[PDB]
Each structure stands twice: as C-alpha cells, then as structure tokens.
RNA sequence: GUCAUCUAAUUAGUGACGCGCAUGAAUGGAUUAACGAGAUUCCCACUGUCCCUACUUGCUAUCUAGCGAAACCACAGCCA
RNA sequence: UUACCGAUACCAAGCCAUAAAAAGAAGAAAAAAUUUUUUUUUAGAAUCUUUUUAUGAGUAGAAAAUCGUGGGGUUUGUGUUGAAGCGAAAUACGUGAGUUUUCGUGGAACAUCUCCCUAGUGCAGAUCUUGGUGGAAGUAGCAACUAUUCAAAU
RNA sequence: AUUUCACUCAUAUUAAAUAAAAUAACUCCAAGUGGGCCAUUUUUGGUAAGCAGAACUGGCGAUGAGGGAUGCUCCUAACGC
RNA sequence: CCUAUUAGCUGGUUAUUUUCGAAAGAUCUCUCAGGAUCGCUGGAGUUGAUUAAUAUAAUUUUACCAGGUAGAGAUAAUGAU
RNA sequence: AUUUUAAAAUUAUUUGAAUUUUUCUUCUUAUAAUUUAAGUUGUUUCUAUACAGUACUUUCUUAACCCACUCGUCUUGAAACACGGACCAAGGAGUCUAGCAAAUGUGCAAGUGUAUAUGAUUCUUUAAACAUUUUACGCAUAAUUAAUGUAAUAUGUCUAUUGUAGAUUUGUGCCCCACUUUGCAUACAAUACCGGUAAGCAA
RNA sequence: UAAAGCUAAAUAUAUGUAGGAGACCGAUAGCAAACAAGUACCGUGAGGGAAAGAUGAAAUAGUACUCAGGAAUGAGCAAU
C-alpha cells in the first residue's frame, strides 16, 4: 500500500523478498528474479511473491530525499562540508560509520555552526 | 489491450549519439547540432548527421575527385565530412577552397601550394553559418573491400561477391562450382 | 601461471555407475582420508582450476609509434594549461605560470635540502606537503607482495643535462625526473590522467622545439615526424556562436510544449 | 563450420603446448649481447671488433 | 576485457544463452571442415564455390624470385618525382625527365591512366606493356629497356 | 521414432511478419540475352547520337573559348 | 493322440499302437546287472503336511540401569 | 421486462519507465517583524534541462543501463578517541541487485563512486567437491558357546 | 527504338475508398529454433479412439487476470504502480 | 601412463532493472535424439520520410482475367444399374 | 524572469446597431475590475502552548477476510504416482591462445606496420620508455589465365565514359513553393578497355 | 668435388644449485606437502597417499591462594 507524507509518495513498502526464501535457509531473502521454467512467481500466479517492476518507481521530484525533505550526504571530514555551506537547506549530513569520536565531535560542531542537520548526531557518545 | 504496430512506439534506425570520445569532435558535434536546430538549414542538419557517422561512412575523398566535383563551381567551397587524401595520378591542382575533417599532409601541402586553403568545420561555421556557396561532397562509401564480400553469397548465380580465401592461386577455390568442367559453374 | 599439472597428479578413476555417488573421478586405494575423494575437476577440493593460467597470455601490447608520439605530445600540451594541472590534483594555486621553466642552474644543484627549498620558493609548499603526507600503507593483500606504500605523484622535473638534478630531487616523495630526449608517457600521464605538473629547465624547454621539428638537427630531431594537427582550428565554439555572422543567421527563438 | 567465414586451416592438431615459447627476455638478451661486445672491444684494446667484408 | 564479455550478462540464466532444447554439446556437426560434400555441403557451395577438386598443372619447385615483378601504371610516373621538379619539367619544353622505375622498385610499366599531353618523358624499365609504350611515345617520350 | 512429416502451419504468419516483400521494380533492365540484331542496332543508334551531340558541344566549346 | 492299466475320479505314471511337425545307428542305435545327495509314478510303514488347532520349554521381544548406531528424508503426512 | 453484482479489459486523474516530439548555450519573488531587518530560494550539467503525447505479457534468445568482489594506476581519504569482519537492527535511501547508518562484539588494518585498468569476479540445485550437523532416536539393538551363588579383601 | 526540342494531362482534396501508411527500404553480424500440441471448419486411413495423417485461421507452447466448482488450449480479456 | 582420450547422449551452468522478442516449416544430408542452409529474431548502420503525401497495405471499390470444388445429372458422353 | 498572455465569460459604466422586444437579448467603442478564464483555495480547530508517552513514525509478533500445490529440469504437456534436492558453510562451470571476418573507436593514408636486430652518460622501477646515415619483409597499391604469359578510355585533352533518379549549391519569381544552375553518395542500366574462352581472319 | 676426420660463437634448457623479481595464491587457495610431507597410513607388489598454520607486546606474565570434591573439575571475598 502507498504511504503519503506531505509531498512524498512511497508507492510501496515492505521490500520484495526472494521466492521460497521463507522456507529455505540457503535461500537468502535478497531479491532474485526467478528464471525457472514453471515458477509460479515468474508466471505471476495469484497470491505469491509479486516481482519488482519499474512501475513502483518513485516520483523523481521527491525520489532520493529523506523524511526531513532533504537529500543525505555522507561525510568523513570537516573539509567535506564546504559544498553544504551553499546547500544547507536541502542537504542533511550523515557521518561515516568509521569516523572516530574526535572527528565526529568536530563535524557536529561544524555542521551546527553551518546550520546543517545531522542524521546520526548522537552516535558514539 | 490495443492493436498497434511495435506496441505503439516509433522506431528509428541508425546512430543517435556520437560514439567517439574525441573532445574536439564532441565540441564540433555540439556546435553543429546547435546550428542545425537554430537555423532551418538542411546543410547544417546534414553536416550534424554526418559528423556522427562511423568511420566507414565518412570515407576519404581524393584530390582528383575533389577537383573534378568542384570543376563547375570555381568560386564556391567544398565541404567534406571525411578526409582529403593526395592523388599522385593528378598532375596539377587549381585553387581549391575545401573544408574537411582532416587533411593528409601531402594533400594539405598540395592545396596550399596551389593557392587554395584547407578549412576546419569550426571555421566553416564561422564564415558560412548556413552553407552559402558550399557544396557538400562525400567519397565512395561502397568502394571499400569489405563491401566486395557483401550482397548475394559467392555461389549464388551471377554473384559478384568475393569469397573469403587464404590465397587466390589456381588451387584455392577454383575447381568445382566455378567452372563447367567440374560439375557446374557459379 | 599456476603449475602446469596442478591438481591432475593423481590416478584417474571414476568408478561411479551404481555406487550411489556422483560420477566424478575418485582417487584410489585406502587407509587415508584422500582415498575415494573427488579427484581433478574445478569443483573438487584440490582438483585444479577451470582454465589454468598460462604464461602465453597476451601480456604485452604493440602500440603504433605515431599514436605513442601523439599521446606524448598531447600530454605535454595538457601539462601546459593551468586548469588541467589543477584538475589532475597538483596544488599550483601559488605558482606564477603553469608552463613554468627555470634557469639551467637547476640541473647543477645537488643537495636534497636545496632542491626542496627551491621547490618551496617556487610556490609549491602545499604540493610538497601533499606529497609528504600522502605516504601511507595501502589496503589489501598487495602489501604482502612488496607493494607496501602508496604515494601521490608530484612535479616531474624535465632536464637536459644531469649535473645533480637526478641525485638531488629523488628521495623527495612523489617527485620523479625525466630527460627531455626520453620523455615517457607513463610519467607524463600517470594512470592516464591528463596534465602533470612539469618543471622544465630552460635548456630542455628550448630543446623541445628541436626535438619536435623546428630548427632541426641531425641526431636530435625526430626524423620525418610531423606534429599532430587539430580537427578544429579554434575550439571556442561559444565565441563562434556569439559571433555576429552566425547570430544573424540564427532564427528566432521558438517555444516548447 | 557455419556462416560466411574463411575455411579454417589451423595446424594445431598435435601437442603444441609443449612447443609454445614466448620471449620474455628479448631486451634482456639485447643488453647481454651489447655488454658482451662492449667487453670484448674493451679487451682487445683499441682495435675494432668488426672485420672488413 | 573480461568484464565486457557477453557471458557475464547471462550469469544467472541457466543455459548461458546456448539454448534450453538444443544445448551446447561438443562438436555436434563434426570437427573442422568435416562435413563438406555431405552435411555442410550447402555452406560449402554457398560460400566457397570452387573448393573441391583440382585444376591445372603442378609447378614442382617454384622459386618466386624468378617471376617477382612489381608493376606501376603510367599515371603514377609523373607523381614519382617531386612537385618542384614536376613543375620545372612541365615549364621547360627543351628537356624531359628520364625515370628509372627499377630504382623505385618496379619491374614492369603498365598502361592504365592518362599521361599529360605534350609532355615528353623517358622511362627505363625491365618490362613494358604495349599500351604503356604506346602512351609513352604518344606524349612524345621513349621507353628504354634495362636489366 | 515416427516424426511429423509435414505441415504448413504458422508459415503464413511467418511470411507476413516481415510482410510479403514486393520486387523492387527498377526503371532499367539488363538487355544481355534479349533481341540481338535489335539491341546491337540500338547501340549503334546511341553511338551516333552521342557522336553528333559531342561534336556539336566541342564546336561550341572551341568557338566560345577561342 | 488312441487303446489298456493304475484311481471313486488320472493334462500325471506304466504297457502298447505309429505316414514319426522334426526318431535312428561311434552326432552312436537298442538293451542292460551293479552303482547315484540325479529326474519321475505308485504301494506299505509313518507321522500336526492337513481336518484344526491346543498346550508347553529355551533364547529374544517387553520394562528398567548402563551403552547406543544406520538406511531413509523436496516439504510433509485423514478421507470421498 | 427491469435493476443489480461482477476483471490485471474500458473511461477520467496521478506517478514510474520506454519511444517519439516541442524547445533551450540571465532577471528578484514572496512572507514575517519594524522606511530597517529576518527567512527561503534567485536555476542553465546537451547521453543535460523544461514541457507534451502515446505506450508497457513474455520462454528460447539478443541488447542497454545499472549493482557487487580480488588486484593495479591516479586522485583524496578513514583508523587505539578502535579498521576489517561478524550478530541484531534502521521514522534511512533505492523498483531492484544493493547502498548507507545505529547498537553490540572485535582488536589492526581499510576504502576511493574522480576517472580508468585488470580478472581464477557473483550459486539453490550438478546421485556436485570438502567439512560440519540434523530428524530417525535414547530407537534398532548389546541373543552362538547349558550357570551361576554365598561371604570376605581392595 | 533511342535522343533533343515543343505544347499540356486533376493536384487550390490529392487520376477510386480507407489507412497512429516512413513504426519505411536496404545492408552487415549474429543468437535460438528446426520433437510440437490444441480448438472451429474441411478432410484421408481406421469399428473406433484423449488414434494416426493433412488444409485454413486462431491459440497453447512462451501467458498471467475475470468467468466455466475443478482443468495448459473454452468464454471475456491479454498484464507498469 | 598415453589421458583432462572421445561422446550427435544425461545432468548442471552463479546479480538487478529496462527494451525487443522466436521456432517447432522447408531443402540437402549413412539423415530420423544430429548438422548445414532458408525462414522466423536481436543488435548495428545507412538511405529515406518527417511536406495528414508519396512509397506502402493479410482491406475494400471499379474494370478485366483464370478455375471445375460444393451443387446438379443419369434421357449429355464414359463407367455402373 | 519576457503567452496563467491573448482572447472567453461576468460585473459596473459607455458608443452605435440589430432584434427573436429584453431585470441572463445579441453584436462592438472605450475604461476599470473579477473568474465561470489561466489543473484548490479559505476559515476554525486539533496535534500543542511537547521534547518521546497510552499520541505520532517505524519494525517485529500474532490474529482475521480473500487468495496461495514443490522448486530445478527434460517435455506439447509437471503439483505430479517423472528425475535431483535431509540441513548449513566454503569451493563450483563459455575461459586462454592461434587464425579469419564483421562491427565500432584511434593514428596515418596510396601508403601503412619499424620485424628480427641495433644505439644510448636509460639500467631500483627499466623485462619499459626513447631512437633508427636519403629500395628488409607483410598487407594494400591490378587483374586474369592450367599455362608460355598478357595486363585496364587514349594523346585528340591538367576535358577526369554516357544516361535516369538523386544530396548540396546558383539565380528568378534573409524566412513558404515552381522554374533555372550544379549533379555527392548510391541504385538501375549503357558503354568502352584488361585477362581467359569461343567465332572470323591469320606471315 | 661423395664414399676419412676435428672445430668456438650466436642456440636450448618442466633438472640441480644460487640469486632477483611479480597488476600471481593467501591455509578447501598456492606444489601433494607454509607443520615431524612423499610423512602418517593402505596394498603381497607395481604403486596409492592425506589431514594438520594463528594465546598474548611479554609466559623472563601459561593461572599463585582459599573453599568443596577420591579425583576430574567447579566456585571465590583470591589472582597474571
């Protein structure tokens, strides 16, 4: 079912799962197109694991932007916020997973004084 | 459901974009696409189309053929989207104004000595934006050896296609099927 | 290449019709774990890879001499334009001009300290700092294959006579030398990148013309070589578009849907 | 065979992998020969190693 | 180059593009040029007509050096020599160039093409075509036999 | 085993998939094996016409170029 | 096969008959006392083979302490 | 004879992609406070940007664009204030392969999507190979050799 | 018969109609396929067959959706969200 | 060990989305579980069209052709009766 | 940010006319506005006068209505009473070389490729880069014939064969069209000329 | 100028030994063998032939002491 939050329309949630991944541990849920011969899902039988298709694609005016109506940008340095000085209102920042506490504190300070929002602001503290 | 040819989508054939990643050629294509759009000139449209063509469809034009084609217009300039190659069989050249993609060194020197001049397509756009006094020319697109193997297969009646053989002696594809004395001919 | 018969140095036997096992070859005998195990085959443990790598792979390539010379000339031309060097990644915001050339006495300086001092005084202190601080151990198993470090490329010093340049500018990380008569495309365009910071001695800069055809001499100029000619006379297509001659030819602006 | 190709002629019906050899040492051998001839023209002390033909 | 190979784009397609019915077997038609005249006969006759049989007599040992004979047509004789000297020879009617095509690497002079009218030219060659000689002396020149 | 001997099924739609192509219908046809002693005479006619036209054109060109 | 005999009852056995699909002579024919863990029919004796099953002994099975596998296994397990 | 119910078909509208098309290489708008400030934006990447219409099954098969892995060059980075890996996750992004983050564990390396080069590069199957582990199951079973018992010592 | 000169035979709706007719024509390289089956109508052999062999078109195959309780082929109708 | 012999035969043949999309006829074949070749298909490219027109059309109309199936007949022929 | 313009309609004035003869009669003359033009705007509440809960977003677990046969494969047809699969991890299959062609990119061009090899104050890298005292060789530049061999308009002219279509160009009725001018590529033909074979002649 | 003979160099080297390298493999990979590997083990024999690397910076820090246990072990207020 679609979910609509403001201008954002997510045409579908609950990401597609690989066919028969529910009852086989060697089959991971990551989607794979069933090539098969008589494969039910490939033939689009009723009531089984619908396949992803381009029709589900999101409106390109609001495609990549987060629930805060901003595009996320992942930084690992204080020096990687200069582009954001001119885009503070439509980009939010996210600190890279492997950035230490010192550099994290510096980046949060710079983002705040740049009034750029931080997604994972309270990580490692 | 709807009963449409090709499910209703118009299908074009041929090149849509430049394949060469040559920055100068890309700039030239951009410029002439703009010229073809902004002017009504079929001249500019044709040049923009031809700048996109593969190598086999912008063949070289010899100096002799260039001068022969330009014989009846001595005052106009000749535009070739291929290359201009020198012709040793030609004895003398005469005052040719020719715009082309590239000129071989011998052809360039011969044209300059004869007193004409070699132009690039950016200069052609600068001086003749709509192609006034400009004759579009192209070399022989079907003269290359690959085309000699095309068409009806060698073995079909009255076929002029060359076969693919290692060599062309008396003992290479010359006995049965190519003369009456051995079964049939052709 | 792998060893020639790797994985195939056992006894071949696939007695497997009616044994209720797969028909893969099995090693014979008994009394050891290996007996009865799957023998050679890309899917078997210790069985030999699918297409064993061979030494007669096409390791090298034959490159047209004219294309190589074209590439070297183009690399020199690219090094001659300021924007391209900056794009390649040299910190040249403080040097006076990008085709910078220095007096021939650079060829005679012999101390690394004074070479570094000259590089700094030219305005490349940031470049030297980038080079010295780029040194660091690389990722991956390349560092157990005698490939421990990974350095960034700095200025290329092009000289004519080696009176100390070679043994004065080496040992500076990221700096390499090249004689003007043996210009190497691998040095001029590292990784295929366009436009490298080049420091020319005056004599090498002058000798470039001799090498490439102007004022030729017997044993220096490239014999019968002609510099590549451009497809376009002037690539400033927007200047030609804004020229009044084609501006008059353009039709009135039309409107979209 | 199929389509319009030259009729195949490859003479690889014997054990050719034993006969393949690739010269990785072409320029190394160049250097070795140059060094040898330099050494002998130094050894003979002025007289050229070339002979008149 | 291995990442541009077409097999990569059939990675999860079972048959690897070789068919689910016909499959990819090992030499299903034979090896090399096996089936000529029997089941590849249509291919052989359609693309290599005169393949089978023999014609002509044997030349037991050839020695191609005996009959090696490069040719040049008369329309390239003037282009053999440089442009400035071509201009000088055309300007001055009292003298003509004598060209030894053997030194340039040609043994026989052939007669294709058009020579410049009223421009004498002397040609030295090992062999001459009849039409080549006719054109040479028609433009007021001479053919000289050399060995 | 026993095989299906023959059928023309699906052949018509195969034919119509690329349409029933028509002959190109060129303006001129080769006269190689057609009416000798007539087309030879036609060759003579064309040669005469060409000779007259060419001599008249040459006369005009010479008298206009002096 | 037909005729006798064997039985109450005989596609079995034995003795005869012989235009024998297609017997036959060291491809050995016919016959043979003695011999045979050889094939076959009948009779006496004998008996749980059977009418028609019952009771009973040992060792298992069984429950417990201890020890403790394997084959088979798409997922599984009511029917019209 | 009416009404009604009834599709992934039909109609209107939105959105995704495909195809085609029309066109294109520079200037202030609004709101909230009180003439002066404040808040947003103030665009120009040509395989691009804006707009328009039509269309969308698909085995065998073909192609394009994408997503990942080992290694190389270039660039520019993260690591003892904890890298890779791993477990669980996420108001996360993508249509999707995936990507990116959090917490925990870990204790030393790791990327590079700037562009490119390279390959032993992507698994559910092959009575696949090697290793590990199940239900069967505390089950089958521990049945030849007649047979053990009392008391004591350790 | 050919060639050159003349004159002119609807075109402003188009030498009959209709036409998402150029989504054309042509060339090159190449994949898979070359066991088919079913329905209507026609039809041969056979007592007949869910039998064997043919013709036309449409399907199934390669294809789901609604209906026929159920059903590879029937009816409606073919499929982005 | 030659030898990883050969197999027209069986089994398997590894990420996503998007677009296009078959054949199970035919000819030859020591051919009938195979192959080549044509047809059907994809990709590439050019020439065209882009000018509600021309080319063009699994359509009709107008004009003109060709047929001996259904039907009919047995007194028109032949063959039956 | 130079068509949410223009008009169209409506309202209020105004000019003239027409007419179905009027409180929605129509047609324009001017002005000013509005929307029925020129794809939804306004008001009031609540969330809420909070900093994370019993609300809101989201993941998961359970239900419930409707639907849902075992995957891979051969096959006309598989959920099959067709075969493989007890489970999990790791490994696991169109590659490499030679040779040919097509396609496309690149360089040069009637030439192209410097082969082997040489030289050079290059010699960690460097087994790579650089270079080649003014007919080596390959392919191409000419074909045809078993072959001795022969070999492409033909010296009237530094015009370069001829037609029919045809791109581009030139003017006349800088942007629509019909006549002129030129005639690329290509297609269809015609002509010559070269090699071979016939035929005629043949010192 | 046969039926007699010698002769260095340019050439080759899946062997042995010794050096040096790599866009190679990274413990199911790479040689069969990173280790006590042609070892253990199997076959009468010819032959066949594995598995098996990682505490920590430092064991010159490899677990002292107490309690409970026959012991193995376990626990701790005890310990590197």
GROMACS .gro file of C-alpha atoms in nm, chain A residues 2-121:
model
  120
    2UNK     CA    1   0.116   0.353  -0.074
    3UNK     CA    2   0.216   0.584   0.209
    4UNK     CA    3   0.192   0.959   0.161
    5UNK     CA    4   0.375   1.204   0.389
    6UNK     CA    5   0.343   1.558   0.259
    7UNK     CA    6   0.467   1.572  -0.099
    8UNK     CA    7   0.640   1.234  -0.060
    9UNK     CA    8   0.467   0.927  -0.201
   10UNK     CA    9   0.626   0.589  -0.131
   11UNK     CA   10   0.445   0.374  -0.384
   12UNK     CA   11   0.524   0.054  -0.190
   13UNK     CA   12   0.685  -0.052   0.138
   14UNK     CA   13   0.778  -0.399   0.270
   15UNK     CA   14   1.060  -0.467   0.025
   16UNK     CA   15   1.034  -0.763  -0.214
   17UNK     CA   16   1.165  -1.095  -0.083
   18UNK     CA   17   1.315  -1.377  -0.286
   19UNK     CA   18   1.072  -1.653  -0.377
   20UNK     CA   19   1.083  -1.951  -0.137
   21UNK     CA   20   1.334  -1.774   0.087
   22UNK     CA   21   1.084  -1.813   0.372
   23UNK     CA   22   1.122  -2.191   0.382
   24UNK     CA   23   1.483  -2.247   0.278
   25UNK     CA   24   1.774  -2.125   0.488
   26UNK     CA   25   2.019  -2.149   0.197
   27UNK     CA   26   1.797  -1.908   0.001
   28UNK     CA   27   1.853  -1.557   0.131
   29UNK     CA   28   1.569  -1.300   0.117
   30UNK     CA   29   1.762  -1.071  -0.121
   31UNK     CA   30   1.557  -1.042  -0.437
   32UNK     CA   31   1.649  -1.257  -0.736
   33UNK     CA   32   1.439  -1.276  -1.049
   34UNK     CA   33   1.307  -1.632  -1.078
   35UNK     CA   34   1.431  -1.763  -1.410
   36UNK     CA   35   1.270  -2.105  -1.378
   37UNK     CA   36   1.051  -2.294  -1.624
   38UNK     CA   37   0.726  -2.332  -1.428
   39UNK     CA   38   0.798  -2.096  -1.141
   40UNK     CA   39   0.463  -1.953  -1.028
   41UNK     CA   40   0.621  -1.619  -0.937
   42UNK     CA   41   0.771  -1.579  -1.284
   43UNK     CA   42   0.435  -1.658  -1.443
   44UNK     CA   43   0.266  -1.416  -1.198
   45UNK     CA   44   0.034  -1.666  -1.034
   46UNK     CA   45  -0.219  -1.511  -0.799
   47UNK     CA   46  -0.120  -1.481  -0.435
   48UNK     CA   47   0.256  -1.542  -0.434
   49UNK     CA   48   0.553  -1.307  -0.408
   50UNK     CA   49   0.498  -1.037  -0.669
   51UNK     CA   50   0.808  -0.926  -0.861
   52UNK     CA   51   0.950  -0.573  -0.856
   53UNK     CA   52   0.890  -0.363  -1.163
   54UNK     CA   53   0.963  -0.013  -1.287
   55UNK     CA   54   0.603   0.088  -1.217
   56UNK     CA   55   0.685   0.110  -0.847
   57UNK     CA   56   0.945   0.380  -0.912
   58UNK     CA   57   0.921   0.693  -0.701
   59UNK     CA   58   0.834   1.039  -0.827
   60UNK     CA   59   1.164   1.183  -0.941
   61UNK     CA   60   1.083   1.521  -0.788
   62UNK     CA   61   1.097   1.359  -0.441
   63UNK     CA   62   1.299   1.048  -0.519
   64UNK     CA   63   1.613   1.041  -0.308
   65UNK     CA   64   1.512   1.277  -0.028
   66UNK     CA   65   1.469   1.168   0.333
   67UNK     CA   66   1.164   1.213   0.560
   68UNK     CA   67   1.308   1.554   0.651
   69UNK     CA   68   1.267   1.655   0.283
   70UNK     CA   69   1.644   1.670   0.238
   71UNK     CA   70   1.897   1.465   0.045
   72UNK     CA   71   2.151   1.289   0.262
   73UNK     CA   72   2.524   1.343   0.212
   74UNK     CA   73   2.777   1.121   0.388
   75UNK     CA   74   3.089   1.299   0.511
   76UNK     CA   75   3.405   1.166   0.671
   77UNK     CA   76   3.584   1.501   0.718
   78UNK     CA   77   3.525   1.855   0.832
   79UNK     CA   78   3.662   1.950   0.488
   80UNK     CA   79   3.368   1.774   0.317
   81UNK     CA   80   3.108   2.030   0.431
   82UNK     CA   81   3.217   2.322   0.209
   83UNK     CA   82   2.968   2.212  -0.061
   84UNK     CA   83   2.699   2.206   0.208
   85UNK     CA   84   2.763   2.569   0.304
   86UNK     CA   85   2.566   2.658  -0.011
   87UNK     CA   86   2.313   2.373   0.021
   88UNK     CA   87   2.232   2.376   0.393
   89UNK     CA   88   1.855   2.376   0.335
   90UNK     CA   89   1.815   2.078   0.101
   91UNK     CA   90   2.102   1.856   0.220
   92UNK     CA   91   2.130   1.684   0.555
   93UNK     CA   92   2.461   1.535   0.663
   94UNK     CA   93   2.543   1.187   0.790
   95UNK     CA   94   2.876   1.098   0.947
   96UNK     CA   95   3.055   0.797   0.802
   97UNK     CA   96   3.044   0.480   1.008
   98UNK     CA   97   3.421   0.460   1.056
   99UNK     CA   98   3.488   0.814   1.184
  100UNK     CA   99   3.638   0.842   1.532
  101UNK     CA  100   3.490   1.033   1.824
  102UNK     CA  101   3.721   1.336   1.791
  103UNK     CA  102   3.644   1.388   1.424
  104UNK     CA  103   3.277   1.320   1.494
  105UNK     CA  104   3.267   1.598   1.752
  106UNK     CA  105   3.442   1.836   1.514
  107UNK     CA  106   3.199   1.751   1.235
  108UNK     CA  107   2.894   1.801   1.458
  109UNK     CA  108   3.030   2.138   1.570
  110UNK     CA  109   3.093   2.249   1.212
  111UNK     CA  110   2.752   2.128   1.097
  112UNK     CA  111   2.573   2.311   1.377
  113UNK     CA  112   2.757   2.637   1.312
  114UNK     CA  113   2.676   2.576   0.944
  115UNK     CA  114   2.312   2.509   1.050
  116UNK     CA  115   2.315   2.180   0.858
  117UNK     CA  116   2.121   1.898   1.020
  118UNK     CA  117   2.296   1.573   1.116
  119UNK     CA  118   2.120   1.238   1.085
  120UNK     CA  119   2.330   1.026   1.324
  121UNK     CA  120   2.409   1.314   1.556
   0.00000   0.00000   0.00000
